[PDB]
Design a protein around this ligand. Structure first.
Ligand SMILES: COCCN1CCN(c2nc(SCCc3ccc(OC)c(OC)c3)c(C#N)c3c2COC(C)(C)C3)CC1
Lengths: 578, 156, 578
């Protein structure tokens, strides 16, 4: 297979364009001078995530490819936003499919899904990630951070903002290098040498809750807990898993390019065996997907679908396997928020493990027939693509060659898809691989009104972003382990458009100014996932030859339709069609 | 005093009950002090070695020895939640209202760590509930600040 | 021996916990995706140093291991404190040992070790690095830094703090781009083009002395020399080295992979011969180790100072140079490191024997020498002093598996050690490899008082850190060579707890506030050296099989004792026992 190296980065609270124009384009522009690169593709998403895939000529040494990529990325790192740099950028040389899933459940229902995920993140994932052959490890859930859930009513009552909160956290959750008594070079006759210990990271919600934000003129104290709820909770809330319908987390493990499948899996089990004796009570490992006695089901809903609606679809999938197929299926491990493609609120995946072969006699109880029957049962689910598969027609990129921009490229894409649909004798299921534009809330900050009021634009933008998007402030120590601190609005003050107006910013003169005084807003459409191909804006189109036609005939026709598109729109073949 | 002194400080530190009895019998200075002014009784109180505490007190250890920052063995026992050591020290005459150089008392320290059984024994032995440290703060302020309603109960 | 790679970082003025929790953990958490890793071990210490050692399977290519580690580290660089990034975080192959150790001494008594180290850095080290067959070259000491040694009494006199000093150095020891007259794009017909040269880095103590801190209201100037002594000195003062009692620097030189030992040694000696003509007076090269060197270790008690250690090392040198004058050519005494730790209470002497041929009879061989030496030093009081010549023993790691914390892991360790003591039939000399907790000075800043007085936390913490720990401010140019500038208190104002109260910080209203107004302190115990194993808190335990027991039996007993420890304590075997 051509080896591929993946760069991943994140920007908390960023929309797709923001990610693309501050991160993705910057990396791409700097991926020069790397040997044997066949092509590069990227997605920039409204989850705040970018993935850049660099695919190398067959025969390329994946180690050299990875090192060359990492080194260019290193020279580009100072060009990226500080918020992106501080999340950690990763570079992996991995297969894109899973080798295995390590599930973790709590048999005594002592621990919620969130607890279990933190336990895995904080106690298991690093040692697995260091096991030789392990290319990529996905946590099905999130590590805890310290979560400061801000209340805008209480902030405004005390004439405070998220900026004051972030400032206080950085000042009061600090790890200070303070020197030594009797330090070198010392005076003659010194008797005592001892470290000076000053501020140290906080370790608990109790300690965060008593951060001192201010002292009122009257002498009363405003503590962080007087304007926020303080709790441990995920760095993010996007991925939730279940094992046979019960709360779970786990690790999805991808094989390092060129490593040995069987050796790596055994190294993994051996590492798990070291951890088990120290689990808290109730906690237990399950094995829901070991790579013909397994398969996957993909769930892909339209952009716009929420966590609740993806979950309803996954509940249908899971139910089918635990009822209609309960004689063949041993388990289902289902993940809401991550799928084939990676991360989104509109996607899911179910890993299905079958009973022993010898106990599924009959060709109707073998994987091929089970997957076919499942796809057929799920083919009627509304506004979802749901199918079961183990783990070919064409792979086309439409390309913006002339700075046309997203809206025009979408119109060209639609023109091509309409033309393709008039040739059903030659092309079947010609479709975009990506996502459709969805409504977004465009808010305009009035620079004039802000200046007239003495309200700083940086205080406005921090207030907006930190409250509605979240902001990674600094690190703390949870039960001995370095983890993140995040500030964000408590959920109920960031749900609806009118909530924008309840957030106040402090002017230079000390007055509190509501957001409504200096902003206006409207609905518009934009992209939840912007694609690029060899550094240019792109839209991936999949399809296949119609029955009784060669792939090459299907491709020749696509090329002909492509030659009639608006000026500045090109194309290229990738993946299986390269 | 002695090289036995240094040995007694090390033995009390590391909890070595027997070696403490021996060094005692050989005339080690019971009130030998290290460079930060900690005596064997400080060291046994901090590290929770109850039996070493008792043995040193029977041998005339100064119950109110103060380190170079004004802290007494009771401050250390109270701060580190060693209840039985706190009782023994108070029975041997530990100053329940001793203040360190910052005006901090054993009650302030037990209160800040939420060591409630210790708070109770301190108050039983006459701890001044209104004693202020250098910043004006009482054990009650400490309870309000830390959000410990159970401790706020006890101290009214 | 399995190949190993060491990551080394420095955080000047940082305590062990500060280093561990802002650097070590962050690095360890990023050590994934690295092939062939058997285990990872780290130490974080009170001299502000971290060493992380990664040990690879036998037959791993050490260059490939090194590059994979370095890339993962480099991608984590923005996660580390600035102060650490500015010191450089090195990644080197560490399983190699030395071709040769060159000493550079001065015999006239005219140069300090810092003077000799600067000479070596500027005039010798790079020519030796380019010598045929030479790989890594380690400098013993540093090039000069410009040392600004502050006086708090003079600072407070003029209402200044170290913050003002650091600001003034950045502003007045600066070198910035100022553009050109007549540069492109010009007015057409322009004839004048000339670079604009504005401030240039400072080059001398005199120039640093004239930096203008402020002009008083009566028009008198306060110059940096009015608040500080200014001299060229070392970048740090942790280590004092002597060669036969004389100040010394030198070079530790490794052989490049594939080169010849004998030709490389000869090429080094010839290169040093060329430099001899240019040496200043008294400078001499010595050769304490070149491919019968033994060691003497020195360990003082908790909190012992550099000066007390020096006295012991000086008795050690004197002994060898009088009582073993027929057998000993040199003693290279290093104060501030040993094996098992850095710190002011540790030291080691490297003793170079005269030729075998000049030491007739068994009484003059290494083994008789070291036994006499140990016998004689067993007198020395308040130090452990031991002479030694480098399938017996075992190397065990006790591991915190459940967030127990340092105090609990130490209690578990002590339990295991008390049990191993009860089986002298089977186990001998079971002991910690590391260091015990020691007194430290805990200073708590009072946030309410700081806020009531208008004193900023950042001013407080910079003033404390910069005075007591030192701070690398920026670079200057010494005789044409870029070098570091450090601020730190003059030694006499940073020695004892009472000196804390001589440091003032300036409030927003302009009043000077002493430290004592907003802080309190107490003595407590904590670690001067924290250890981690495979990413978890750890304590290494060494030991051996008793008289005629196998190591296998001894290990089995340790395993059985280890199974009775408190909940959440695990173990592993490492090094020779892996
Ligand atoms: C960062 O320090 C760790 C390096 N270790 C291995 C090399 N080593 C060694 N040092 C010496 S001589 C002392 C060198 C020295 C001088 C000043 C210093 O001050 C800055 C200093 O610190 C680096 C070292 C010798 C010999 N002979 C050997 C080793 C090594 O062992 C031999 C047997 C080869 C002879 C010193 C310790």
């Amino acid at each position: 297979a051509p080896p591929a190296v993946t760069i991943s980065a994140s920007y908390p609270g960023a929309d797709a364009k923001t990610v693309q124009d501050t991160v993705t384009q910057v990396i791409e522009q700097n991926m020069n001078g790397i040997d044997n690169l066949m092509y590069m593709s990227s997605n920039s998403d409204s989850t705040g995530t970018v993935q850049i895939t660099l695919t190398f000529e067959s025969g390329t040494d994946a180690d050299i490819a990875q090192v060359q990529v990492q080194n260019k990325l290193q020279l580009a790192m100072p060009l990226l936003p500080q918020e992106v740099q501080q999340q950690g950028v990763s570079v992996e040389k991995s297969s894109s499919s899973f080798l295995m899933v390590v599930g973790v459940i709590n048999t005594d229902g002592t621990m919620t899904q969130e607890d279990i995920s933190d336990y895995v993140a904080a106690n298991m994932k690093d040692a697995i990630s260091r096991t030789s052959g392990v290319g990529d490890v996905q946590l099905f859930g999130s590590q805890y951070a310290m979560r400061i859930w801000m209340n805008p009513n209480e902030l405004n009552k005390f004439q405070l903002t998220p900026v004051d909160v972030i400032t206080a956290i950085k000042a009061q959750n600090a790890q200070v290098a303070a020197g030594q008594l009797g330090g070198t070079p010392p005076v003659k006759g010194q008797q005592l040498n001892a470290s000076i210990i000053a501020q140290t990271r906080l370790t608990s919600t109790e300690e965060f809750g008593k951060i001192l934000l201010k002292v009122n003129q009257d002498g009363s104290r405003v503590l962080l807990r007087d304007v926020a709820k303080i709790e441990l909770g995920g760095e993010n809330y996007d991925i939730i898993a279940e094992f046979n319908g019960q709360p779970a987390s786990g690790l999805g493990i991808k094989l390092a390019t060129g490593a040995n499948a069987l050796d790596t899996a055994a190294a993994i089990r051996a590492e798990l065996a070291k951890m088990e004796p120290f689990f808290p009570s109730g906690l237990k490992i399950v094995y829901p997907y070991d790579t013909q006695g397994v398969f996957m089901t993909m769930v892909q809903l339209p952009a716009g679908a929420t966590q609740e609606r993806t979950q309803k679809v996954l509940n249908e999938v899971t139910h089918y396997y635990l009822t209609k197929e309960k004689n063949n299926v041993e388990s289902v491990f289902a993940v809401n928020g991550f799928g084939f493609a990676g991360r989104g609120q509109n996607t899911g995946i179910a890993f299905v493990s079958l009973k022993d072969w010898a106990d599924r006699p009959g060709e109707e109880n073998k994987v091929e027939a089970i997957t076919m029957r499942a796809t057929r049962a799920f083919s009627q689910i509304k506004d979802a693509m749901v199918f079961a598969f183990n783990l070919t027609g064409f792979d086309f990129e439409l390309i913006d060659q002339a700075g046309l921009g997203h809206e025009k490229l979408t119109q060209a894409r639609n023109q091509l898809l309409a033309e393709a649909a008039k040739h059903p004798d030659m092309l079947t299921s010609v479709r975009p691989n990506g996502l459709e534009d969805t409504p977004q809330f465009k808010i305009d900050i009035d620079q004039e009104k802000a200046q007239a009021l003495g309200v700083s634009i940086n205080d406005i933008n921090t207030t907006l972003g930190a409250a509605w998007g979240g902001s990674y402030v600094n690190d703390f120590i949870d039960r001995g382990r370095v983890k993140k601190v995040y500030v964000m609005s408590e959920a109920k003050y960031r749900m609806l458009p009118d909530d924008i107006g309840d957030w106040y910013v402090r002017a230079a003169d000390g007055q509190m100014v509501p957001f409504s005084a200096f902003s206006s807003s409207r609905w518009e459409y934009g992209s939840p996932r912007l694609e690029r191909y060899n550094g240019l804006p792109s839209m991936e189109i999949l399809g296949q030859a119609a029955p009784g036609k060669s792939t090459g005939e299907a491709m020749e026709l696509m090329e002909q339709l492509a030659s009639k598109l608006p000026t500045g729109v090109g194309y290229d073949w990738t993946g299986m069609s390269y | 005093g002695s090289d036995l002194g240094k040995k007694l400080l090390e033995a009390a530190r590391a909890g070595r009950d027997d070696e403490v009895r021996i060094l005692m019998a050989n005339g080690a200075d019971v009130n030998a002090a290290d460079v930060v002014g900690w005596t064997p009784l400080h060291l046994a109180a901090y590290w929770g070695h109850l039996e070493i505490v008792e043995v040193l007190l029977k041998n005339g250890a100064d119950v109110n020895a103060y380190d170079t920052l004004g802290s007494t063995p009771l401050h250390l026992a109270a701060h580190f939640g060693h209840l039985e050591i706190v009782e023994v020290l108070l029975k041997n005459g530990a100053d329940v209202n001793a203040k360190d150089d910052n005006g901090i008392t054993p009650l302030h320290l037990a209160a800040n760590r939420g060591h409630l059984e210790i708070v109770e024994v301190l108050l039983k032995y006459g701890a001044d509930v209104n004693a202020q440290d250098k910043f004006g703060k009482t054990a009650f302020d400490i309870s309000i600040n830390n959000g410990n309603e159970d401790l706020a109960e006890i101290l009214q």
